[PDB]
Design a protein around this ligand. Structure first.
Ligand SMILES: Oc1ccc(Oc2ncc(Cl)cc2Cl)cc1
Ligand SMILES: Oc1ccc(Oc2ncc(Cl)cc2Cl)cc1
Ligand SMILES: [Cl-]
Ligand SMILES: [Cl-]
Ligand SMILES: [Mg+2]
Ligand SMILES: [Mg+2]
Ligand SMILES: [Mg+2]
Ligand SMILES: [Mg+2]
Lengths: 8, 228, 228, 8
């Protein structure tokens, strides 16, 4: 599964 | 701390240099030093902290998965188990370090939604990484869930549905449900409702914010395709 | 040494695991421990040693080049210089470690052409990496040249022109001439003669050896295209 | 410039 990028 | 003698501004500057050089262990050590100066972090600095440790643990997770797969095949000498344990222990050390920074004292000083949700999401993330290797497992899972849930409650009250932090939190909580908590239906429901609610708020955004939000929405979509 | 308590065979096994996991710092530490057991290395083990340290220093060289470029642009606070120096010092430490292993006592115990040329090539390589950051520079360059030259003399006497070790040595010595020693004409001459002599020996090889040799010949060709 | 692979 894809998770969030670190930089938001 | 080995960074105690360096100026905060110099640590931030060197974290950015380390990022450009793809030296993420250095980057994390610089940002740890910056956190330990005791001041709250700016939005930019929070992102540098996350980038650094996410790349460090990302390499450890990838290595752990390689070694675990080899170990499981070998169970279809002690060296494979020993080396997997070595990487696992280093991974847990990094997670414990991040969780320690969040607990001393980033979360308790974070009052604004953007910082508090960011840090609580991070807390959920690094308990999730601990959960991936745990076999304490139930309590680690509960700690991840609790952190994600507090972040979710704040984000729904204080942030618009397209806020990238809110979206990235919902994305990662849905991954937690699917990969960790054996709750694929909860994962699908969270991803779909998050996607649909963000869709309906895109009209409020500038071109640049639109790009930020839709990038994460595409990750929610990709997961829904994989999960259904 | 931190690896002194581990069996030689276990260190080799774990070096191979670290390679699969792309954990090259671990891989180098395991192979350093294996070298320090005092026995000569097999062909496979020599390659593991080289793979490990070449990937470690490769990351350091790439980071150093990024930081040096930033530093030169800044000269068109001390932080950029300090951090470049930090990476540079770590890079030099790795090179010194490899050179120390070669001098204590891999080279002096290597009697067969394949091992002796391999180690002397490595000695030239890691002095070349030191030369890339040196500004002692002349003496470091001379040390690289001397090692490459002894390796070349042995390889031409004892190895066929298509031997991959001989070819990789000639390739790297030609890069030394072009990038380090300000001798592009020597570099071109060495690359062309090496390529042509290997071409004429390919007919002696099996299908598998043919593939090994032609891979390196293509690198010689690519450099000649870049240099002419 | 291209240099040699590690494994030979
Ligand atoms: O009840 C449901 C209906 C459809 C569904 O699947 C998707 N929903 C949204 C997107 Cl963007 C992509 C997909 Cl594959 C999930 C639950
Ligand atoms: O005198 C010379 C003549 C040609 C030359 O260039 C090449 N020689 C061989 C190859 Cl494989 C590729 C090249 Cl571009 C170099 C020196
Ligand atoms: Cl180990
Ligand atoms: Cl520094
Ligand atoms: Mg100060
Ligand atoms: Mg169902
Ligand atoms: Mg023994
Ligand atoms: Mg000329």
């Amino acid at each position: 599964s894809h998770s969030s990028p670190a930089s938001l | 701390g080995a960074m105690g003698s360096m100026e905060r501004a110099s640590l931030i500057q060197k974290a950015k240099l380390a990022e450009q050089a793809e030296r993420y262990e250095d980057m994390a050590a610089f940002m740890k030093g910056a956190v330990e100066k005791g001041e709250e972090l700016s939005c930019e600095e929070r992102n540098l902290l996350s980038v650094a440790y996410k790349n460090v643990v990302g390499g450890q997770r990838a290595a752990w998965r390689v070694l675990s797969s080899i170990e499981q095949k070998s169970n279809e000498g002690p060296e494979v188990r020993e080396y997997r344990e070595k990487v696992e222990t280093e991974l847990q050390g990094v997670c414990d370090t991040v969780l320690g920074l969040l607990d001393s004292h980033l979360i308790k000083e974070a009052g604004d939604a953007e910082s508090r949700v960011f840090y609580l999401k991070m807390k959920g993330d690094y308990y999730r990484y601990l959960a991936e290797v745990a076999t304490d497992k139930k309590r680690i899972i509960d700690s991840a869930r609790s952190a994600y849930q507090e972040a979710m409650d704040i984000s729904k009250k204080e942030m618009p549905p397209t806020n990238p932090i809110r979206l990235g939190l919902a994305l990662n909580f849905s991954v937690f449900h699917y990969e960790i908590a054996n709750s694929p239906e909860e994962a699908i429901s969270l991803a779909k409702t998050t996607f649909d609610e963000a869709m309906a708020d895109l009209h409020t955004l500038s071109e640049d914010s639109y790009k930020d939000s839709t990038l994460i929405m595409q990750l929610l979509r990709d997961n829904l395709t994989l999960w259904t």
